[PDB]
RNA sequence: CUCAAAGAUUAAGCCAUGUGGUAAUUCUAAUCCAAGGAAAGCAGGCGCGCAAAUUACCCAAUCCUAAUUCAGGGAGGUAGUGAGGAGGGCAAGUCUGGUGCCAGCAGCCGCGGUAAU
RNA sequence: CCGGACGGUGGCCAUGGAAGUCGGAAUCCGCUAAGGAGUGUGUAACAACUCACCGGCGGAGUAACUAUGACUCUCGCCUCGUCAUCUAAUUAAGUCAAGCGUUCAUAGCGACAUUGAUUGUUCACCCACUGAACUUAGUACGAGAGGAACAGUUC
RNA sequence: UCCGUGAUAGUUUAAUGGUCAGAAUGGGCGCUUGUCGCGUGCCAGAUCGGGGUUCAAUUCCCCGUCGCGGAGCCA
């Protein structure tokens, strides 16, 4: 999401006027939870597509409709959000000019043009989902760092999307005439501090898992050791506990390009630790470790995890992509409460993509599962089943 | 894109008790969670049913089943193309059938449960194939259509019209005594009635089969080998075009099974169509012009291959793999120890084992003679020869069960013994019986590999022995003999009722324990290969069956094998690829050359 | 030798050092085999590794179907030409150098072998036995 | 987007057909046509028509 | 109802089956291999594609082939398989409910932005 | 060497579950010879061990997209380059112990601090090979996944 | 790495004698004009971060941060 504006009128303490640009189908789902019935939107389309009848005849234009919302057709798989509505009929002429009043009109959303939401019921829950991201489902977990010898991009993935949050960048070492003119080491030293500060703030650095460190040359490796040097200096145990968030990659190209060079190329990636399968894999391990030695310390399935939670034995929560994105909206509220509820009793969380072997194993298990901290026998009783 | 696949589920009702589990299958399945159909409960018979259409192939249900009642497999849609018949929901289904051809003999070979028996009924007109569907009220018409593209199509038109009525030699060997008494009265009556052919045929058929003694006896009275042969007689005597034999080698001895094979082949000469099913490769090779191989998991499925040559089909069988089907049907390949392979030890133990003097046992109708021989420790001796020779009598005497007419064998030794024909006569269940003999033998890993896991005795544990099956009972009995410690162990004809995999599990069993424990064993056998693997010495029996007999001292493997095979006059050169015995025809130059060398068999040994 | 080679092999005169090209004698589409390595061969400064009868090599196809060219695969030497000597005292030799493309386990890629095949190779590689006509 | 596929067919409300006199087939139907079109005529409001609803 | 075209276009692409010896031939004094050696006609299958049927019956007819008959013949003959439109050009005023440049129509012209010929 | 190791009670709050034994302080009472609101081993959670303590023993801006920059404004080093193409192949030590190590500082680690191508190529980077193979054995162990050796044999 | 050389409003660059800081463009402000824009009137800097000296420091020292040029030998 990109939010062009967002202002708070003086005549209305409550609601808001948000101009915004949805960027992917995760951002379609965001729009969904913001837009209410009886809010207004003004977007554009392309109406003038009359009779004949007198003249040819049409005209063309690019006519923008101030439509009040009545309904929605929302299909997440299909990347289709559509708002049905009636013209607000701006008799004032300032808006809605060129449209013929008295005639319903729809908005199929596109990622191309921004639109304005005149909101009535702008709440604190929507605001979270507009300025932190809005994947109450969570698909990702990544951040990258490309550096060539002269340019760097700190990249980053989202709180929701494969959507950049912060394009950092330092003064990168460029292979100077002398031994690599000392400006290299001080400036590189700066970057770590710059990237650590950004990721600490942007994130709750307990939400991202991955930093990929990517270079043409030895630069990446140099930088890793430099990270953990400064780490020992500060006694920064946020970094030192955790050899598994940095992963050291080589690429040819290193602009924003570099990332997709690294990932999709089988040089440095596969299903080993990219850290957006990280703890996802490690906890789904431990989940079957327990469950197959019939120990009562792992439990599985939408019926069974909600009951394993009622007994309040659960730590590491295993959730999926499929059961979320397969088709269904509503349903993912229930599971989100259920993550917090469970953690309010104990635990972290792992969302696994079902586009993969691991997510498929858990999906054959209703896409929801757990590991407990402690055995709580016969969690399948009270609630009736197996 | 990806290749195509399917799911097939077969459930065993014997294994399933829904009360204890609960209908857990439905509850645990992920498809049903969603509201789908994969597992449906049948309120009637009270069984779980799994539909193949809705099932995911997850296998979650299989793991959850407390017993191990459910099996889900994933196939590349190999089975779907071929569907001939299915017994019912979640039961055995048959795939393909064997071609019949006039003037020739077509073989069939496979492991038990493949549907070789079923296939015969379908060809017989006894059962009508449903076609994996509803087909039931005589819909022979649909079967021809299903067979189109196959040579069987012509046969099915013939069968419906009833131009030909096939004659069937019934398969189940255990079942026959109950069914017939007399045939009505005595075997002789059967042979006179059935004889459509020549008056010569009555005499000739009896002479070749060695039925002369048996005519006066009743069918119920007959021993297993005798029982088989009378059936064969009726299948020559009958007038017809198609003669189906289903397992004609069962119960028979080594000499007799070869004899049966020749006579059956004579039918091809009159240009009468013949079909046959065999567990024995020696027998199968001789009989057949063409051979089919039946493969697949037992009781789950079994497919018939396209027709093949005699030599070719046998070669492929032994590999354990079939290329078009691309299935490794058998988990491990069969191999025989070279004798170079064996461990080299100085053997005596206490200086040699016990020894027996000349023995004689005379019933008054049969007389057995035995030549003084010696037995040593940690050795194994095979006993071969035709039945009625007193192979059984000899073992009994050593067991102490029988008292010799002359001679004596009073040994200090503790003996364990396994009888030849096993009929239940013990009250109790299978687990109780085996536990009394020895628990702890049951704990060993060796016993898990050979007995418990393959059959699934766990399910058998509650079942009564009277209620039991033939082959399953056999492996259990052999194991039980091994259950208790003894200086010497005695086993009589372990190969009965067993298919290829089953016998070979036994071969590994006797050799390994004996070697390890440093104890001795005597094993009686008809199967060539089993004797070779286990033994170090052999005793050959000779004489005339049902009259008199003789035994010899133990002699080396090479020496004993030459004598035995010389009595048969069939040489088994060697096949270079398979290392299998390759049979040699009578009067020949190559075979003639061997007779001058004294080599009936070949192995990875030096020799010309 | 190595994988799938059931049997040992008595030493026989090395005929084919690296760089040698033998005839491809199967029906795989390959016309020749260019030897780049011998399996199980040892090390001595300056010595070319060199194969013989029933050795498994690593080759590329210099001449043949393009789907076979530009890559390295296993092959097995089936005919020699450098004369060698058996333990029955005989010094013998074929008219050509030739081998057949194969998999690490030792399975033929093709289905026929054209020409004769020396027994020491037949004895070594069962799937080679299968596809052989005249042996030795 | 695939999304919409079959949106409208699936959102039109069923209405079942109605049960009506069987029309004769063949020569008889031609007869009906000839009498309807040519014999007792029908209307001629201005000229002629072959089915309007309210006019 | 009688009359019957029919796997040529794609791939003249590929085809299951219908006194003595010897593995085995109508033996002779890309397939089966006792390792020696021997072997685009009907139906029907695979494949191919947009694309074409049955493993049937028969000599009765029409004639053909062999010698003074009435033998032979899937040449041949019988059977089986195998018939949318209602805006205009077009002719129907199209009317009633759902849809809103979404779904869809529409050979072209053009329809479709709640009152849709 | 061994016996005994006990009642208030499973202290109190934090408590998802913490009954002495991850945690926040607080250390009492009765017992009787002596038995800690509890040394370490803890099943989630008591137990069940234990022990203490009684005792038996030249520079920048520009984006109806990121980037670039049509436009406005001002005075072959890195390199073995990247893509192809030709190759099977191508420069043609130790101390301290805070920490990790999911439970545990030292299994395994430890901050701070401190005592044949291609090239002249070395190098570097690929392509291949191989102590190995064979039985021992798909064995022992393992829910599986997988996976030994000693003996004997050939290289 | 040394020695040289800089940096001023959104941006590029003029400037001083120790007491005084600009231009141009870009922008924000109207008017033009059908309506935008060109045009035409109107508008607005912590002089890189830093410490020191002095009555008074944009101006005079000292350091860094960055961007530049110039060297780079006999192995
Ligand atoms: N009445 C039945 N109901 C269901 N399945 C049956 C029935 N009779 C036989 N079967 C199935 O058909 C398969 C068996 O038989 P067939 O009698 O066809 O075997 P075979 O192939 O002759 O084997 P075997 O060598 O063991 O005698 C079995 O595995 C079994 O599952
Ligand atoms: S099959 Fe197994 S789990 Fe299912 S009902 Fe029977 S016993 Fe229970
Ligand atoms: S395998 Fe899976 S999907 Fe099929 S029946 Fe069992 S649980 Fe249901």
mmCIF file of N, CA and C in Angstrom, chain A residues 175-245:
data_model
loop_
_atom_site.group_PDB
_atom_site.id
_atom_site.type_symbol
_atom_site.label_atom_id
_atom_site.label_comp_id
_atom_site.label_asym_id
_atom_site.label_seq_id
_atom_site.Cartn_x
_atom_site.Cartn_y
_atom_site.Cartn_z
ATOM 1 N N UNK A 175 36.869 -0.224 -4.037
ATOM 2 C CA UNK A 175 38.074 -0.772 -4.582
ATOM 3 C C UNK A 175 38.929 0.310 -5.134
ATOM 4 N N UNK A 176 39.492 1.030 -4.192
ATOM 5 C CA UNK A 176 40.292 2.174 -4.469
ATOM 6 C C UNK A 176 41.730 1.679 -4.670
ATOM 7 N N UNK A 177 42.528 2.635 -5.226
ATOM 8 C CA UNK A 177 43.915 2.518 -5.657
ATOM 9 C C UNK A 177 44.779 1.866 -4.573
ATOM 10 N N UNK A 178 45.022 2.479 -3.377
ATOM 11 C CA UNK A 178 45.526 2.001 -2.121
ATOM 12 C C UNK A 178 44.784 0.710 -1.691
ATOM 13 N N UNK A 179 45.238 0.129 -0.535
ATOM 14 C CA UNK A 179 44.680 -1.105 0.081
ATOM 15 C C UNK A 179 43.131 -1.260 0.256
ATOM 16 N N UNK A 180 42.378 -0.165 -0.054
ATOM 17 C CA UNK A 180 40.920 -0.108 -0.169
ATOM 18 C C UNK A 180 40.543 0.919 0.711
ATOM 19 N N UNK A 181 41.214 2.091 0.637
ATOM 20 C CA UNK A 181 41.044 3.351 1.292
ATOM 21 C C UNK A 181 39.921 3.461 2.337
ATOM 22 N N UNK A 182 40.407 3.463 3.638
ATOM 23 C CA UNK A 182 39.844 3.189 4.973
ATOM 24 C C UNK A 182 38.461 3.615 5.207
ATOM 25 N N UNK A 183 37.999 4.754 4.530
ATOM 26 C CA UNK A 183 36.627 5.127 4.268
ATOM 27 C C UNK A 183 35.709 3.926 4.033
ATOM 28 N N UNK A 184 36.202 2.813 3.400
ATOM 29 C CA UNK A 184 35.486 1.542 3.208
ATOM 30 C C UNK A 184 34.953 1.017 4.435
ATOM 31 N N UNK A 185 35.777 0.669 5.447
ATOM 32 C CA UNK A 185 35.499 -0.017 6.689
ATOM 33 C C UNK A 185 34.621 0.787 7.614
ATOM 34 N N UNK A 186 34.919 2.124 7.751
ATOM 35 C CA UNK A 186 34.040 3.090 8.537
ATOM 36 C C UNK A 186 32.656 3.333 7.978
ATOM 37 N N UNK A 187 32.564 3.513 6.680
ATOM 38 C CA UNK A 187 31.340 3.648 6.038
ATOM 39 C C UNK A 187 30.493 2.374 6.079
ATOM 40 N N UNK A 188 31.112 1.135 5.945
ATOM 41 C CA UNK A 188 30.414 -0.154 5.983
ATOM 42 C C UNK A 188 29.820 -0.373 7.403
ATOM 43 N N UNK A 189 30.626 0.082 8.431
ATOM 44 C CA UNK A 189 30.422 -0.025 9.859
ATOM 45 C C UNK A 189 29.104 0.797 10.153
ATOM 46 N N UNK A 190 29.006 1.928 9.418
ATOM 47 C CA UNK A 190 27.839 2.819 9.549
ATOM 48 C C UNK A 190 26.548 2.147 9.168
ATOM 49 N N UNK A 191 26.602 1.362 8.053
ATOM 50 C CA UNK A 191 25.484 0.787 7.369
ATOM 51 C C UNK A 191 24.862 -0.129 8.318
ATOM 52 N N UNK A 192 25.647 -0.968 9.039
ATOM 53 C CA UNK A 192 25.100 -1.975 9.982
ATOM 54 C C UNK A 192 24.267 -1.356 11.008
ATOM 55 N N UNK A 193 24.701 -0.223 11.561
ATOM 56 C CA UNK A 193 24.047 0.618 12.453
ATOM 57 C C UNK A 193 22.792 1.271 11.913
ATOM 58 N N UNK A 194 22.886 1.742 10.694
ATOM 59 C CA UNK A 194 21.720 2.232 9.901
ATOM 60 C C UNK A 194 20.699 1.113 9.668
ATOM 61 N N UNK A 195 21.056 -0.112 9.199
ATOM 62 C CA UNK A 195 20.133 -1.170 8.972
ATOM 63 C C UNK A 195 19.520 -1.764 10.230
ATOM 64 N N UNK A 196 20.324 -1.937 11.294
ATOM 65 C CA UNK A 196 19.841 -2.384 12.592
ATOM 66 C C UNK A 196 18.848 -1.447 13.157
ATOM 67 N N UNK A 197 19.076 -0.108 13.092
ATOM 68 C CA UNK A 197 18.138 0.902 13.601
ATOM 69 C C UNK A 197 16.824 0.851 12.838
ATOM 70 N N UNK A 198 16.843 0.728 11.481
ATOM 71 C CA UNK A 198 15.642 0.789 10.655
ATOM 72 C C UNK A 198 14.653 -0.372 10.868
ATOM 73 N N UNK A 199 15.332 -1.590 10.869
ATOM 74 C CA UNK A 199 14.651 -2.881 11.104
ATOM 75 C C UNK A 199 14.047 -3.076 12.488
ATOM 76 N N UNK A 200 14.775 -2.494 13.526
ATOM 77 C CA UNK A 200 14.329 -2.405 14.957
ATOM 78 C C UNK A 200 13.011 -1.603 15.066
ATOM 79 N N UNK A 201 13.040 -0.431 14.344
ATOM 80 C CA UNK A 201 11.914 0.475 14.375
ATOM 81 C C UNK A 201 10.697 0.059 13.509
ATOM 82 N N UNK A 202 10.936 -0.207 12.257
ATOM 83 C CA UNK A 202 9.952 -0.550 11.200
ATOM 84 C C UNK A 202 9.152 -1.752 11.577
ATOM 85 N N UNK A 203 9.903 -2.768 11.999
ATOM 86 C CA UNK A 203 9.389 -4.023 12.311
ATOM 87 C C UNK A 203 9.146 -3.921 13.804
ATOM 88 N N UNK A 204 8.860 -5.117 14.384
ATOM 89 C CA UNK A 204 9.030 -5.515 15.696
ATOM 90 C C UNK A 204 9.856 -6.629 15.103
ATOM 91 N N UNK A 205 11.216 -6.494 15.253
ATOM 92 C CA UNK A 205 12.309 -7.355 14.673
ATOM 93 C C UNK A 205 12.228 -8.775 15.215
ATOM 94 N N UNK A 206 10.975 -9.286 15.348
ATOM 95 C CA UNK A 206 10.517 -10.468 15.899
ATOM 96 C C UNK A 206 9.387 -10.881 15.012
ATOM 97 N N UNK A 207 9.382 -10.334 13.749
ATOM 98 C CA UNK A 207 8.264 -10.502 12.795
ATOM 99 C C UNK A 207 8.890 -10.869 11.515
ATOM 100 N N UNK A 208 9.980 -10.171 11.128
ATOM 101 C CA UNK A 208 10.883 -10.629 10.175
ATOM 102 C C UNK A 208 11.865 -11.674 10.693
ATOM 103 N N UNK A 209 12.250 -12.486 9.754
ATOM 104 C CA UNK A 209 13.146 -13.466 10.067
ATOM 105 C C UNK A 209 14.361 -13.239 9.258
ATOM 106 N N UNK A 210 14.305 -12.609 8.067
ATOM 107 C CA UNK A 210 15.390 -12.855 7.101
ATOM 108 C C UNK A 210 15.988 -11.522 6.883
ATOM 109 N N UNK A 211 17.321 -11.619 6.850
ATOM 110 C CA UNK A 211 18.167 -10.741 6.173
ATOM 111 C C UNK A 211 18.981 -11.678 5.209
ATOM 112 N N UNK A 212 18.924 -11.415 3.847
ATOM 113 C CA UNK A 212 19.809 -12.012 2.872
ATOM 114 C C UNK A 212 20.842 -10.960 2.589
ATOM 115 N N UNK A 213 22.090 -11.357 2.598
ATOM 116 C CA UNK A 213 23.225 -10.463 2.405
ATOM 117 C C UNK A 213 23.859 -10.918 1.080
ATOM 118 N N UNK A 214 23.775 -10.081 0.002
ATOM 119 C CA UNK A 214 24.027 -10.532 -1.383
ATOM 120 C C UNK A 214 25.041 -9.581 -2.037
ATOM 121 N N UNK A 215 26.065 -10.055 -2.896
ATOM 122 C CA UNK A 215 27.086 -9.221 -3.429
ATOM 123 C C UNK A 215 27.575 -9.993 -4.670
ATOM 124 N N UNK A 216 28.038 -9.243 -5.683
ATOM 125 C CA UNK A 216 29.159 -9.684 -6.435
ATOM 126 C C UNK A 216 30.484 -9.362 -5.755
ATOM 127 N N UNK A 217 31.251 -10.345 -5.308
ATOM 128 C CA UNK A 217 32.526 -10.272 -4.631
ATOM 129 C C UNK A 217 32.440 -10.858 -3.223
ATOM 130 N N UNK A 218 33.532 -10.757 -2.432
ATOM 131 C CA UNK A 218 33.702 -11.213 -1.066
ATOM 132 C C UNK A 218 32.943 -10.325 -0.094
ATOM 133 N N UNK A 219 32.274 -9.234 -0.499
ATOM 134 C CA UNK A 219 31.674 -8.111 0.231
ATOM 135 C C UNK A 219 30.637 -8.575 1.233
ATOM 136 N N UNK A 220 29.810 -9.478 0.852
ATOM 137 C CA UNK A 220 28.825 -10.043 1.681
ATOM 138 C C UNK A 220 29.341 -10.768 2.954
ATOM 139 N N UNK A 221 30.305 -11.658 2.694
ATOM 140 C CA UNK A 221 30.986 -12.338 3.715
ATOM 141 C C UNK A 221 31.734 -11.410 4.668
ATOM 142 N N UNK A 222 32.399 -10.375 4.134
ATOM 143 C CA UNK A 222 33.114 -9.317 4.874
ATOM 144 C C UNK A 222 32.197 -8.597 5.800
ATOM 145 N N UNK A 223 31.017 -8.222 5.197
ATOM 146 C CA UNK A 223 29.965 -7.589 5.927
ATOM 147 C C UNK A 223 29.394 -8.392 6.973
ATOM 148 N N UNK A 224 29.294 -9.734 6.878
ATOM 149 C CA UNK A 224 28.626 -10.669 7.865
ATOM 150 C C UNK A 224 29.493 -10.596 9.098
ATOM 151 N N UNK A 225 30.775 -10.625 8.906
ATOM 152 C CA UNK A 225 31.745 -10.853 9.996
ATOM 153 C C UNK A 225 31.835 -9.572 10.744
ATOM 154 N N UNK A 226 31.883 -8.438 10.009
ATOM 155 C CA UNK A 226 31.685 -7.027 10.437
ATOM 156 C C UNK A 226 30.435 -6.843 11.246
ATOM 157 N N UNK A 227 29.267 -7.461 10.894
ATOM 158 C CA UNK A 227 27.996 -7.394 11.630
ATOM 159 C C UNK A 227 28.237 -7.955 13.038
ATOM 160 N N UNK A 228 28.711 -9.191 13.072
ATOM 161 C CA UNK A 228 28.920 -9.968 14.301
ATOM 162 C C UNK A 228 30.119 -9.451 15.081
ATOM 163 N N UNK A 229 31.059 -8.636 14.564
ATOM 164 C CA UNK A 229 32.115 -7.927 15.254
ATOM 165 C C UNK A 229 31.560 -6.865 16.141
ATOM 166 N N UNK A 230 30.784 -5.998 15.547
ATOM 167 C CA UNK A 230 30.059 -4.922 16.180
ATOM 168 C C UNK A 230 28.992 -5.391 17.137
ATOM 169 N N UNK A 231 28.466 -6.592 16.922
ATOM 170 C CA UNK A 231 27.582 -7.360 17.695
ATOM 171 C C UNK A 231 28.200 -7.674 19.033
ATOM 172 N N UNK A 232 29.468 -8.118 19.011
ATOM 173 C CA UNK A 232 30.208 -8.486 20.226
ATOM 174 C C UNK A 232 30.685 -7.335 20.985
ATOM 175 N N UNK A 233 30.835 -6.163 20.287
ATOM 176 C CA UNK A 233 31.196 -4.982 20.850
ATOM 177 C C UNK A 233 30.137 -4.457 21.761
ATOM 178 N N UNK A 234 28.886 -4.425 21.254
ATOM 179 C CA UNK A 234 27.738 -3.904 21.971
ATOM 180 C C UNK A 234 27.147 -4.890 22.903
ATOM 181 N N UNK A 235 27.622 -6.212 22.845
ATOM 182 C CA UNK A 235 26.970 -7.357 23.521
ATOM 183 C C UNK A 235 25.522 -7.408 23.187
ATOM 184 N N UNK A 236 25.164 -7.227 21.857
ATOM 185 C CA UNK A 236 23.877 -7.236 21.177
ATOM 186 C C UNK A 236 23.360 -8.570 20.948
ATOM 187 N N UNK A 237 22.866 -9.147 22.025
ATOM 188 C CA UNK A 237 22.340 -10.504 22.009
ATOM 189 C C UNK A 237 21.094 -10.651 21.186
ATOM 190 N N UNK A 238 20.506 -9.576 20.619
ATOM 191 C CA UNK A 238 19.378 -9.683 19.699
ATOM 192 C C UNK A 238 19.881 -10.306 18.392
ATOM 193 N N UNK A 239 21.156 -10.095 18.080
ATOM 194 C CA UNK A 239 21.889 -10.495 16.898
ATOM 195 C C UNK A 239 22.625 -11.831 17.214
ATOM 196 N N UNK A 240 23.241 -11.908 18.476
ATOM 197 C CA UNK A 240 24.177 -12.984 18.798
ATOM 198 C C UNK A 240 23.531 -14.321 19.050
ATOM 199 N N UNK A 241 22.186 -14.304 19.482
ATOM 200 C CA UNK A 241 21.413 -15.530 19.719
ATOM 201 C C UNK A 241 21.122 -16.153 18.443
ATOM 202 N N UNK A 242 21.288 -15.490 17.281
ATOM 203 C CA UNK A 242 20.470 -15.670 16.171
ATOM 204 C C UNK A 242 21.420 -15.611 15.023
ATOM 205 N N UNK A 243 22.061 -16.796 14.728
ATOM 206 C CA UNK A 243 22.772 -17.081 13.518
ATOM 207 C C UNK A 243 21.782 -17.380 12.394
ATOM 208 N N UNK A 244 20.518 -17.483 12.703
ATOM 209 C CA UNK A 244 19.515 -17.708 11.785
ATOM 210 C C UNK A 244 18.556 -16.598 11.694
ATOM 211 N N UNK A 245 19.137 -15.432 11.251
ATOM 212 C CA UNK A 245 18.369 -14.561 10.423
ATOM 213 C C UNK A 245 19.209 -14.014 9.327
#
